[PDB]
């Protein structure tokens, strides 16, 4: 009962290549607040800022 033919040999499966996706988002920029005038002249307000 030993077969004369030799058995066929299986081919192993292909492994999966794990891949990541890196995307970026776009947040909208902020606008300016309102111009509020003050009492001070230029150099004092400049140094303060």
């Amino acid at each position: 009962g030993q077969p004369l033919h030799l058995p066929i040999y299986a081919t192993p499966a292909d492994p999966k290549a794990l891949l990541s996706a890196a995307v970026a988002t776009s947040q909208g920029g902020g606008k300016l607040p309102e111009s509020f005038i003050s009492l001070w002249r230029f150099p004092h307000m400049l140094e303060n800022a």
Binding site: L18, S20, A22, A24
Partner: protein, 49 residues
Amino acid sequence: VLQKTGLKTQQEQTQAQLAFLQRKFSNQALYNWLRGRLAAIYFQFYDLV
């Protein structure tokens, strides 16, 4: 067989670390953006000084 499944667990862990280093906040694209913006501001400020 247990050695093989241990190695596949190691591979999945390496994939997890790589996805972490891509998807964390301070990644390489952040520093590229910072170096570009800071370089432009730095050059213009150099000219004024």
